[PDB]
Amino acid sequence: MALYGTRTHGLFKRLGIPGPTPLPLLGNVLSYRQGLWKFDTECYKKYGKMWGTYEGQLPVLAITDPDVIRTVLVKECYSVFTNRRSLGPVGFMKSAISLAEDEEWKRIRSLLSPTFTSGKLKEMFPIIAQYGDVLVRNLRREAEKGKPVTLKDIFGAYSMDVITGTSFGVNIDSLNNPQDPFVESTKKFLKFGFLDPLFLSIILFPFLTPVFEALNVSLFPKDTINFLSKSVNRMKKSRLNHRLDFLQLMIDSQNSKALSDLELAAQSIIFIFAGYETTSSVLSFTLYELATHPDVQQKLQKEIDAVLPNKAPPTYDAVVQMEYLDMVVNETLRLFPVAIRLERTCKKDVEINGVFIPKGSMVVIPTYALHHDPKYWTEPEEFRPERFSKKKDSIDPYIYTPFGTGPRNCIGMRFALMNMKLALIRVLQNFSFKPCKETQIPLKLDTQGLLQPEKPIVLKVDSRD
Numbered sequence: 001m002a003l004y005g006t007r008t009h010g011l012f013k014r015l016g017i018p019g020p021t022p023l024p025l026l027g028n029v030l031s032y033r034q035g036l037w038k039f040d041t042e043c044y045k046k047y048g049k050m051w052g053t054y055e056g057q058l059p060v061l062a063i064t065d066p067d068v069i070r071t072v073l074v075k076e077c078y079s080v081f082t083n084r085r086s087l088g089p090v091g092f093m094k095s096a097i098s099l100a101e102d103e104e105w106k107r108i109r110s111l112l113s114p115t116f117t118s119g120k121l122k123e124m125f126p127i128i129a130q131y132g133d134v135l136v137r138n139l140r141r142e143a144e145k146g147k148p149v150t151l152k153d154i155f156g157a158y159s160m161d162v163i164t165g166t167s168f169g170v171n172i173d174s175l176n177n178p179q180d181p182f183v184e185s186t187k188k189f190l191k192f193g194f195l196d197p198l199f200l201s202i203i204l205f206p207f208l209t210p211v212f213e214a215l216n217v218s219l220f221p222k223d224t225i226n227f228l229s230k231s232v233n234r235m236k237k238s239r240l241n242h243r244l245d246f247l248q249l250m251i252d253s254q255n256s257k258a259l260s261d262l263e264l265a266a267q268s269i270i271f272i273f274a275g276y277e278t279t280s281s282v283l284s285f286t287l288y289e290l291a292t293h294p295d296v297q298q299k300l301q302k303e304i305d306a307v308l309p310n311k312a313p314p315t316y317d318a319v320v321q322m323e324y325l326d327m328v329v330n331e332t333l334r335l336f337p338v339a340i341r342l343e344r345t346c347k348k349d350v351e352i353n354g355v356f357i358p359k360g361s362m363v364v365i366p367t368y369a370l371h372h373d374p375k376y377w378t379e380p381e382e383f384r385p386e387r388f389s390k391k392k393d394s395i396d397p398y399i400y401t402p403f404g405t406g407p408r409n410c411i412g413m414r415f416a417l418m419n420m421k422l423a424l425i426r427v428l429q430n431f432s433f434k435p436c437k438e439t440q441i442p443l444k445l446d447t448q449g450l451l452q453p454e455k456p457i458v459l460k461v462d463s464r465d
């Protein structure tokens with residue numbers, strides 16, 4: 001098959017860009033089975049500054065130079081690298097900001113940015129902090145049994161709870177309501193992005209996307225999409241007969257081009273999708289590191305108690321004072337950047353660092369590989385929150401990209417950091433975490449989708465009182 005399915009496969013050779021030999025039709029996609037985080041790390045070690053791979057026929061150029069990264073993510077964002085990976089079959093979800101393209105993305109990002117400011121976070125803090133209470137008592141009921149706790153169920157419930165309450169102003173108590181159609185629908189998001197036959201065919205043959213769209217085939221759970229879209233239209237219609245949440249802000253902006261009713265539903269769903277799995281995973285990763293580093297956990301516990309004595313309820317200003325908590329979260333996101341990488345598409349032919357890249361090619365910023373580079377991080381595999389202390393050198397924002405950077409960065413980063421810090425404060429005020437004989441040590445990572453532990457994180461949870 002040396003001449004069937006190898007049409008673009010000589011591009012990087014003619015450019016002088018190194019990279020592993022692709023296979024006909026598949027390209028290098030078989031190398032994804034070990035995990036994208038592992039593939040990016042090994043390619044970085046082997047080839048250095050730049051390497052090229054093929055997703056089927058699609059050329060993929062990875063770059064690690066901070067200056068080139070700044071060029072792709074900031075300087076030429078609106079001019080060359082405005083979109084990400086080519087859109088798959090998603091139906092009306094194509095207007096969600098995470099999947100919008102070109103001028104449609106610019107308008108929707110513009111309309112939504114007032115919702116995600118630090119000012120808006122301050123006003124919404126009390127709504128968010130209320131869900132720390134549900135998290136603590138959920139954790140208490142499971143800790144009271146003396147039996148080790150599976151964190152993914154607790155923090156998965158909190159993650160779904162807090163993002164749903166911030167979105168629609170309703171507490172769903174996910175852990176204790178598994179028959180709720182909303183809870184059952186949203187859990188189906190956990191199976192997204194796996195390298196199943198349909199997903200693999202879309203990456204290999206992106207020209208099949210209009211076929212699957214015409215067949216009403218989607219990468220999202222269609223039933224979940226239809227329920228949430230119907231639930232959104234039910235909630236706005238009920239409000240037509242002083243609410244502070246994501247939905248109300250979008251409704252008000254709609255009554256102030258404007259957001260379409262379909263576009264509003266896409267954003268509402270995508271906010272739940274974005275905050276659900278990622279926030280839960282980082283929270284579970286943080287506690288593994290705290291349990292396996294009790295000195296860090298006790299030092300963090302000391303800072304919480306010094307800022308909020310007598311189990312004081314957290315305030316926005318109290319969180320800003322917790323320097324070590326910021327260091328712990330930052331270092332957890334260095335070790336486990338759950339999105340693994342950043343991706344952009346060349347909207348036109350472009351010269352990247354003196355290399356010609358054809359229109360349509362993908363550029364990858366390997367966040368995970370850059371996060372584990374010993375060139376930038378002393379003992380890169382060690383959990384050391386001390387890297388992010390003000391007594392060290394400034395962190396390069398193009399090397400450390402857990403939320404991306406530039407105009408296309410994570411719009412919900414502030415809210416995500418807040419959601420995680422609040423949860424960490426509450427549980428650490430009440431509980432201490434230590435490993436048991438069931439704790440996978442050292443931790444091993446999965447090989448598909450978002451960064452996730454290969455086996456669920458299980459820990460012994462002891463009340464401080």
Ligand code: HEM
Pocket residue numbers: 097098099109270271272274275276278279282337338339341342343401402403404405406407408409410411412413415416417
């Ligand atoms: C710890 C949790 C999170 C992590 C680690 C994370 C990470 C990321 C990353 C790496 C990107 C890609 C940025 C790039 O292309 O430069 C992104 C995009 C995005 N995230 Fe998050 N994210 C998190 C939570 C959230 C939450 C809770 C929301 C919803 C409120 C959200 C909404 C979005 C949106 C809308 C985009 C696309 C922005 C655009 O296309 O302009 N994210 N996120």
Ligand SMILES: O=C(Nc1ccccc1Cl)N(Cc1cccc(O)c1)c1cc(C(F)(F)F)ccc1-n1ccnc1
Pocket residue numbers: 084097098099192193194270273274275277278338339410448449450
């Ligand atoms: O990793 C993500 N999803 C995922 C989940 C499970 C397995 C595999 C994957 Cl890839 N991402 C992060 C992301 C990636 C690219 C552009 C973005 O804008 C954002 C995500 C994806 C989408 C989308 F494209 F699938 F619709 C929507 C939102 C997010 N998301 C999560 C946190 N913040 C944003």
